[PDB]
Symmetry: C4
Subunit: 39 residues, 4 copies
């Protein structure tokens, strides 16, 4: 068990979460455009 690897694994997991939330942000931007042009 290399603590350094553990740190790299955790950072990789946090990066994945970040990207997921970012795609959720884009879906909300998408919705807001849908409404902004229709309404």
């Amino acid at each position: 068990m290399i603590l350094y690897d553990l740190q790299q694994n955790l950072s990789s997991s946090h990066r994945a979460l970040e990207k997921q939330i970012d795609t959720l942000a884009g879906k909300l931007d998408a919705l807001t455009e849908l409404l902004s042009t229709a309404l």
Copy 2:
């Protein structure tokens, strides 16, 4: 305290967060369908 267990616990916590965000994504897809057919 087994560092390996600590790593498995952290990975399990990150997996749970991922699934939670995924369900939030599905709720937004749901909303976007609601509006897309009504509007």
Copy 3:
């Protein structure tokens, strides 16, 4: 530095993130009700 404390701190941080995402989920449920009755 007690690895056990480190684990409890991390779990507490993940719990806080979970609750935050949960409140975001509730805001989306709120929006979906707003639209579902108006539309």
Copy 4:
């Protein structure tokens, strides 16, 4: 590898995720205002 640094790095990563989710919350508040005045 200083376990303390590892802890500070993890806390910094969790803080970044928190702020990201917070900005997503603000985008949803923004959308809800858009609809609340138009509808």
